Paper text:
CYTOKININ RESPONSE1 ([name]), the main cytokinin receptor, has a modular architecture composed of a cytokinin-binding CHASE (Cyclases/Histidine kinases Associated Sensory Extracellular) domain, followed by a transmembrane fragment, an intracellular histidine kinase (HK) domain, and a receiver domain (REC). Perception of cytokinin signaling involves (i) a hormone molecule binding to the CHASE domain, (ii) [name] autophosphorylation at a conserved His residue in the HK domain, followed by a phosphorelay to (iii) a conserved Asp residue in the REC domain, (iv) a histidine-containing phosphotransfer protein (HPt), and (v) a response regulator (RR).
The structure of [name]-REC was determined in two isomorphous variants of space group P21212 with two protein subunits (chains A and B) in the asymmetric unit forming a homodimer. The structure of the [name]-REC-[name]+ complex (referred to as [name]-REC-Mg), determined at 1.7 Å resolution, encompasses residues Leu918-Ser1057, extended at the N-terminus by a Ser-Asn-Ala cloning artifact. In the final model, subunit A is comprised of 139 residues and subunit B of 127 residues. In chains A and B, there are two, and 15 missing residues (Ser1056-Ser1057/Ser1043-Ser1057), respectively, which could not be modeled in the electron density because of disorder. Each subunit binds a magnesium cation. There are 182 water molecules, one ethylene glycol and one (4S)-2-methyl-2,4-pentadiol (MPD) molecule in the asymmetric unit. For protein structure analysis, the full C-terminal construct from the [name]+ complex above is used. In the [name]-REC-Mg complex, the octahedral coordination sphere consists of six oxygen atoms: two Oδ of Asp929 and Asp973, one backbone O atom of Gln975 and three water molecules. The lengths of the Mg-O coordination bonds range from 2.15 to 2.30 Å. As a result, the [name]+ ion lies farther away from Asp1013 and a water molecule fills up the coordination sphere, bridging it with the Oδ atom of Asp1013 (helix α4).
Author numbering:
A (entry chain B): 916 to 1042
B (entry chain A): 917 to 1055
The structure:
């Protein structure tokens, strides 16, 4: 697959600037993008059945972080599978750039000169 | 070898990390001293010391790597104030633990992966400076 034409993608992030950046990146490849400012708003949009092909999930959000949002999505999918035999599995990718940048920023602020980086630390994972 | 003649302090509360870091550095010829905590590291870094660099775990109980680094820098700043001598220990964060833990919780919570290095739109970093008034301009 070269393009995201015909795909509809949910971007979940409490920071509107991140939502704009992520949306612009995905639309460049043809995606239709819907934004959600919280995990709560996202769970509402993902009530099964829904029309989303993938979701990018911020980690640090107040009230409900991205891990709790994801657990709730997987619980919904598990209930539907058990009640209907239909197996939904929304692709969910974390947006980890924020947490990594914040870690390096605190290293710098504390007075460190740099960091040791192992090959895995800055790679993306699409599993 | 690459680090022959260098002495390096490894600060990490996990013995396995200390083993791996010291083993790597010795492969390059370095002398390695390990410390299990910030408080131990600060005792070892009383000025003057003989260390050429320090690898600093960020997450440790009682004193984390940021606090330990701030106190090292305070030691160095006081030395400059009192003696005029310049001390600036290279300190590199060991971040693999915190980043591992984040990626692991992504997968444990049920995510299919993560994006730390995103695609960046052509226009993300581009912009034009514009002036309200006409203005000549040169290098
Ligand atoms: Mg956030
Ligand atoms: Mg630690």
């Amino acid at each position: 697959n070269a393009l995201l034409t015909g795909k509809k993608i949910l971007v979940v992030d409490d920071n509107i600037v991140n939502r704009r950046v992520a949306a612009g990146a995905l639309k460049k490849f043809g995606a239709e993008v819907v934004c959600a400012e919280s995990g709560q708003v996202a769970l509402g949009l993902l009530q099964i059945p829904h029309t989303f092909d993938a979701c990018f999930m911020d980690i640090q959000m107040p009230q409900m972080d991205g891990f709790e949002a994801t657990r709730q999505i997987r619980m919904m999918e598990k209930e539907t599978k058990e009640k209907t035999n239909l197996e939904w599995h929304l692709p969910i990718l974390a947006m980890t750039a924020d947490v990594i940048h914040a870690t390096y920023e605190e290293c710098l602020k504390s007075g460190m000169d740099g960091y040791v980086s192992k090959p895995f630390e800055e790679e993306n994972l699409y599993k």
